């Protein structure tokens, strides 16, 4: 459900973004 929105939101720390139960964390840079 758009995580599309998420993926920027680990990016605030180390990362990119994907997809937990609805709301996301990281992927690496």
């Given at each position: 459900?758009?995580?599309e929105d998420?993926?920027?939101h680990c990016a605030?720390?180390?990362a990119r973004a994907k997809c937990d139960?609805?709301?996301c964390v990281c992927e690496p840079k």
């Amino acid at each position: 459900a758009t995580c599309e929105d998420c993926p920027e939101h680990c990016a605030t720390q180390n990362a990119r973004a994907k997809c937990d139960n609805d709301k996301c964390v990281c992927e690496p840079k």
